[PDB]
């Protein structure tokens, strides 16, 4: 498995765009690696089709996308035509799909599905998502099972939070949406906040402590 | 770390309700164990306050809630009054808070924060969520960092998916909400589907295969 802040493995894999080396492919960019259990299955088709629908939202944010299952590249290419169809978007696939036929990555990344195996007994991946920073470190992960399709709007929401809080001394509260007020992080002194967050609100709480500090979302 | 379908550790820990052994505390119930980096911090307050606001939503689904940080129980109790205040909901805390001061749970569960440490240099937890079935197995997890508050509506959404898909031969598509059409799992034969899913629709795809099969939610 991979924990937050670890350097993502600089793996070599085959894909729909040929062989790649992950750190080279990603470069100095934010990235999202996401897996699915099997090509030619229904939820998986809805998910990759949704990602096509959202490709511009990821592109606007400088976020490179890459898919993964344990199927082979020929199956990815054929199935990709079904994905395009369901997406309702015409044009070439906007992201590569990695072929993890040896299950090396499924195991390394702690992403084996609990229930779904091939008829021949081979493991398969779950519906994992890994958000990787330009420093190649894991910033956020989810592990959803085969039964449960993902919410890619939540993935966009957390990307917005991660990119903002990388740059500014804020953290995003429960259910934050871009443009909503943020919290000033505990490490910022009152003296520093005078300049940095001149409209900051310190909300009084029963403990009498001074940590509950809101500010408008900074420009970033 | 813990992978999906692993039996969750039957840990012994202190908490705001006293000593607990996790499997015994959970019993024959769905559960949601969720962590936060530190008591008396703002995002964390908003999150734990939001879970109080949602406690009725979790209860109606038969889901027990339990929180966790590496702080002590005295701090948990004191800070809980701030959480209650923020929540706008009067009354006793509706879930316990575990004290993981040894960091054994932080490390075992793969939930150490990448950035936040104590001033004394010690690890802290991130904003993890673990959804555990009645069989004590891990069904779904998320690992969010300290910087990024969670969406507990999404947690409710996936509970609904997990609970439905445990009982019926369906899987929930991208962005599914309760009431939306589901997908018939590949394993179900056309013949079985005549009975089980009489209003199933098969959508034609370029590959010509028959797997894109929708059904109203059972």
Automatic annotation (TrEMBL), chain A:
Source superkingdom: Eukaryota
Function: Thiol-specific peroxidase that catalyzes the reduction of hydrogen peroxide and organic hydroperoxides to water and alcohols, respectively.
Keyword terms: Antioxidant, Oxidoreductase, Peroxidase, Redox-active center
UniProt key word Zinc: no
Family, per entry: Belongs to the peroxiredoxin family. Prx6 subfamily.
Any one of the GO BP annotations: cell redox homeostasis
UniProt lineage: Eukaryota, Metazoa, Spiralia, Lophotrochozoa, Annelida
PROSITE patterns named among the record's database cross-references: THIOREDOXIN_2 (PS51352)
Name of the protein described by the UniProt record: Peroxiredoxin 6
GO cellular component: cytosol; mitochondrion
InterPro entries: AhpC/TSA, Peroxiredoxin_AhpC-typ, Peroxiredoxin_C, PRX_1cys, Thioredoxin-like_sf, Thioredoxin_domain
Organism: Arenicola marina (Lugworm)
Active site (catalytic residues): 44
Leader peptide range in chain numbering: none
GO molecular function annotation: peroxiredoxin activity
Keyword Oxidoreductase recorded: yes
Gene field: Prdx6
Thioredoxin domain location: 2-164
A Pfam short name: 1-cysPrx_C
From TrEMBL, chain B:
Gene Ontology biological-process entries: cell redox homeostasis
CDD domains named among the record's database cross-references: PRX_1cys
A Pfam family recorded for this sequence: 1-cysPrx_C
Keyword Oxidoreductase assigned: yes
Record's keyword terms, sorted: Antioxidant, Oxidoreductase, Peroxidase, Redox-active center
GO (cellular component) term, any one: mitochondrion
GO molecular function annotation: peroxiredoxin activity
UniProt domain Thioredoxin: residue ranges: 2-164
Active site: 44
Purpose: Thiol-specific peroxidase that catalyzes the reduction of hydrogen peroxide and organic hydroperoxides to water and alcohols, respectively.
Family: Belongs to the peroxiredoxin family. Prx6 subfamily.
Official protein name in the record: Peroxiredoxin 6
Organism, scientific name: Arenicola marina (Lugworm)
Lineage summary: Eukaryota, Metazoa, Spiralia, Lophotrochozoa, Annelida
């Amino acid at each position: 498995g991979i924990t937050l802040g670890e350097v993502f493995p600089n793996f070599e894999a085959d894909s729909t765009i040929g062989k790649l080396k992950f750190h080279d492919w990603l470069g100095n960019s934010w990235g999202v690696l996401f897996s699915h259990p099997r090509d030619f299955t229904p939820v998986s088709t809805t998910e990759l089709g949704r990602v096509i629908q959202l490709e511009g939202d990821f592109k606007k944010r400088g976020v490179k996308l890459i898919a993964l299952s344990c199927d082979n590249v020929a199956d990815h290419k054929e199935w990709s035509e079904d994905v395009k169809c369901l997406s309702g978007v015409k044009g070439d696939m906007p992201y590569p799909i990695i072929a993890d036929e040896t299950r090396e990555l499924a195991v390394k990344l702690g992403m084996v599905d609990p229930d779904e195996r091939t008829s021949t007994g081979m493991p398969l991946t779950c519906r994992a998502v890994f958000i990787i920073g330009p420093d190649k470190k894991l910033k956020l992960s989810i592990l959803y099972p085969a039964t449960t399709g993902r919410n890619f709007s939540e993935i966009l929401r957390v990307i917005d939070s991660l990119q903002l809080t990388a740059q500014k001394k804020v953290a995003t509260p429960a259910d934050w949406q871009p443009g909503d007020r943020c919290m000033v992080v505990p490490g910022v002194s009152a003296e520093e906040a005078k300049t940095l967050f001149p409209n900051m609100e310190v909300k009084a709480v029963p403990s009498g402590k001074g940590y509950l500090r809101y500010t408008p979302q900074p420009k970033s």
